[PDB]
């Protein structure tokens, strides 16, 4: 009676544990991958991250400058 009205079967806890373990393992793998990607992006500068501004080339004036040699 106690088992029938207060508890469930073993398979429920078993499969809930499986799902929880899958989620946690995926999160750990993602954390490691994110750290490695951050290291590579900061070292190389070839990714979307750690982009530091340079002078906009639209500010340059392309006209004759009263002197032939610029």
């Amino acid at each position: 009676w106690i088992a029938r009205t207060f508890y469930d079967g073993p398979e429920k806890n078993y499969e809930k544990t499986m799902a929880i373990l899958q989620i946690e393992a995926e999160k750990a793998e993602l954390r490691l991958k994110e750290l490695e990607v951050r290291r590579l992006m900061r070292a190389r500068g070839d990714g979307p991250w750690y982009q530091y501004p340079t002078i906009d080339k639209a500010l340059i004036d392309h006209s004759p400058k009263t002197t032939p040699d610029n």
């Binding site: 995926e26 999160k27 993602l30 954390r31 070839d46 990714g47 979307p48 982009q51």
Partner: protein, 57 residues
């Protein structure tokens, strides 16, 4: 038979017909470095959320 040019005439911007070829790289520039890959796509929700310590969202 020379006629003196009038006011505002010697400061005109004229056109020149020359056979000298137009220089292609007068600045002697090198090759510009290639731009960054410029990733693009559809945004999907973050996998398992923020993934910050114990937060599940």
């Amino acid at each position: 038979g020379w006629v003196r040019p009038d006011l505002g005439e010697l400061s005109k911007v004229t056109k020149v017909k020359t056979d000298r070829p137009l220089p292609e790289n007068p600045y002697h520039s090198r090759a510009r470095p290639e731009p960054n890959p410029e990733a693009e796509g559809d945004l999907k929700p973050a996998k398992h959320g923020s993934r910050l310590f114990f937060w599940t969202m």
